Ligand binder design. Structure first.
Ligand code: ANP
Ligand code: ANP
Ligand code: ANP
Lengths: 311, 311, 311
């Protein structure tokens, strides 16, 4: 029920031809269709004045904000679900868990468990609201080929759900390059129209972007392309309130650091760092998150997935 | 009491039809209606000569400057309120605080606390004049979705005010694109007609402008659009004397820098830089401000908001 | 004593009605009334032949040049006062200072100190001729709202003058748009009739002109309007010999530059560039000035105003 469909903005100014171009353009709702600047709609082989009428009409009949106090907004935030991670110590750290209708991503070294957390979340989101993760199908865009359904099965056994049913409600595709990476998101937006989603794990979203192209010159272009990809996610984030989790790679300071420069920085509504401890033990620390201060946690990696310190 | 309303410029040349177009055009006062060039009024389906009469009539009965010495002006500046930041060290830096009827904005890296300062100011402005921040409702245009009423509650507890009352006097809306960004300002101007305002925090005003469009070609257009947005703010700044605070993003030099190019530069009646120090500690330094020289400060981020170096 | 009044051109052809229109037209002298071509006077609801008689009469009794050698003119240039800047290094650069009965303007980046220099000059012009700046009241048209009387007080303390008296002899108004910008100049011309003036700082004269209107189309109009504004200044420059200083904004080359195209180019009787150096230090360099070739200078910004390199 979360969004209002495109076929709803059919007041008296949605003809066949009019709405024959908006869907194909990549608009499968009224929200993301309003959210768009005159700039957007005009660049899609429409008529200047015809397209302008389309905007104003929909906008009046979509609640396009206009200083709606703060008390009312405060209540809005109380209704937002927070997904459980499976570790009590990790849950405590997030004062509940991973926020929806936001951007939340972790980076660390290889072996640290960023890929791990994603698999665990893919299952934990397939539960009753009362048991943390609220009902809603999970989508996984992997870029590393590090998807392992077997890992999901072990998590399903811990939480005592039918593996086969859980795997029906997690959806997968592999993005293989930058242009594909962006392109895949348009398919994503269509997917969440038909059925209610809760979760995105985009495995290594930004990690592809380093091998992708350039290096040090015509990187301007990379930052532009990433920023464009990232704004789309955020569009997708407020439109439906699906929870965006991105995986990140790191680079040494050489004079230990989340890659992609700053563009990813300003995007992040919540940041996390992983590093390896002794044996199976691992450390998560918050980096940048508006809500709660910087804090550390012990947790471990069990055969059941991401759990508390077995010791 | 700060402005004179549109229905005041009703001497003998404000008919129904005459004043039926000025409001809808985006004029909710006599100040901003005078401040306008013949250019402005003429571009709004009015009559050349009819509109010209409207200008001259209002202008004579609005004190449209004309070399009113400097001693008189000096006294005017003594009457301007300076908002407190909550950190004594930070307050000292601004020889009182954030000037009203101006443009004051900070930029830094992610995690630095630009968003932080905004939330803190949103509360500090809801106080008696004697306790720094003068009485007058706060308006928050966010673009990042980094608004957290919870953060405001912690600040309210420190200063011992009713959270619920404070949240009634802070107003919120999210701008989602360039055209929306500008559009939202027209609603803003109407808002401050009905009730007395003190504060604007526009979170990431300029930060939206990078993902917004183009890059390196047809950027001319971006600068034009930003400059237009920025002049409107300034219009709003002298008209009512509401205090404008803008958040900014940064870009690496690649051969560390406030984005949007120079257009934002000339706008700024006061500039600030934030960077991260060791632990919870942070550094603010002044950049460009006509009044006081370049100086540095230690401050920290407490659970109460932006405070002094706990140490 | 600098000009001859309008009521002086009352030989035998200045009636009530005749001189009832020239003042209101914007003529408060014989100089600017003579400099005007037939075109001017005829466009102000006068009689063709009546207005023609008005021209010829005044012209005969105003010394309207007529190829007056070179040697005599050379002596005229020796009598022109040159205002001090307060920095010995900066003074040396101008072989004395800012020429009067001319157009002298600086541009640079934000933070560079163009606004700074203006404030400093506003005080330095309130002195005995022997101490640089010659006696005569200062007028400041600001467009940015970057006027700070406090800055003038610090300068007054250095030069040991009564702040209150100095502020009585600096006059201020804010121009808020193009039409206002031009309009304000007519009030200016009247101001200098009653009392002897020395100085104009027009803060950001041209800087308003970019946000003002258009962009890339119907810019021909901007050029026309600026050129008209600029010619008026020059009229004001030869008429009274009041010293015109204009502030300018800059634009990136995008393939660092004084804004407003070429029209400002030909106007400039002397040009200056500012850029930031290390710490409080700044560099001024001459651009285009007929008199002395291109040279560079170190100077600094002290709490006393614009001074020499403290080091
Ligand atoms: N079934 C399992 N039970 C317990 N531990 C496991 C299991 N499978 C793998 N591990 C270990 O748990 C750790 C998890 O980190 P891992 O998620 O593999 O890092 P990562 O995020 O994949 N790095 P990248 O390869 O760049 O994506 C590894 O060090 C593995 O050896
Ligand atoms: N309740 C709290 N008490 C103390 N510290 C906090 C609290 N909440 C968050 N923090 C931390 O304080 C810092 C504030 O910086 P922050 O305001 O989040 O940067 P920012 O301006 O939001 N960057 P952006 O995400 O681009 O808008 C962060 O590094 C947080 O970890
Ligand atoms: N009282 C003071 N003493 C010493 N330095 C100061 C003082 N006040 C301001 N400054 C600094 O001196 C510099 C002067 O430049 P400034 O005149 O502010 O540039 P500008 O011409 O105003 N640019 P714009 O904002 O476009 O008009 C700034 O970088 C200030 O931080």
């Amino acid at each position: 029920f979360g969004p209002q469909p495109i076929s709803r903005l059919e007041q008296c100014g949605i003809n066949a031809n009019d709405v024959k171009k908006l869907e194909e353009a990549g608009f499968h709702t009224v929200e993301a269709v309003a959210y768009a600047p005159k700039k957007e709609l005009i660049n899609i082989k429409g008529i200047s004045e015809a397209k302008a009428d389309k905007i104003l009409a929909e906008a009046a009949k979509l609640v396009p904000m206009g200083f709606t106090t703060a008390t009312e907004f405060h209540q809005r935030r109380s209704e937002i679900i927070q997904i459980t991670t499976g570790s009590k110590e990790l849950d405590k750290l997030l004062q509940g868990g991973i926020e929806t209708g936001s951007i939340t991503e972790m980076f660390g070294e290889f072996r640290t468990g960023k890929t791990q957390i994603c698999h665990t979340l893919a299952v934990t989101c397939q539960l009753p609201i009362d048991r943390g993760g609220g009902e809603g199908k999970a989508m996984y865009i992997d870029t590393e080929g590090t998807f392992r359904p077997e890992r999901l099965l072990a998590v399903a056994e811990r939480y005592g759900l039918s593996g086969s049913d859980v795997l029906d409600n997690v959806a997968y595709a592999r993005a293989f390059n930058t242009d594909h990476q962006t392109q895949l998101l348009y398919q994503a937006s269509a997917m969440m129209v038909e059925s209610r989603y809760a979760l995105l794990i985009v495995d290594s979203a930004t990690a592809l972007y380093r091998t992708d192209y350039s290096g040090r010159g015509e990187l301007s272009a990379r930052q532009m392309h990433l920023a464009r990809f990232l704004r789309m996610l955020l569009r997708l984030a407020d439109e439906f309130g699906v929870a965006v989790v991105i995986t990140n790679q790191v680079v040494a300071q050489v004079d230990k650091k989340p890659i992609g420069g700053n563009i990813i920085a300003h995007a992040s509504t919540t940041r996390l760092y992983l590093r390896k401890g002794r044996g199976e033990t691992r450390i998560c620390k918050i980096y940048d998150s508006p809500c709660l201060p910087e804090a550390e946690a012990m947790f471990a990696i069990n055969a059941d997935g991401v759990g508390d310190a077995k010791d």
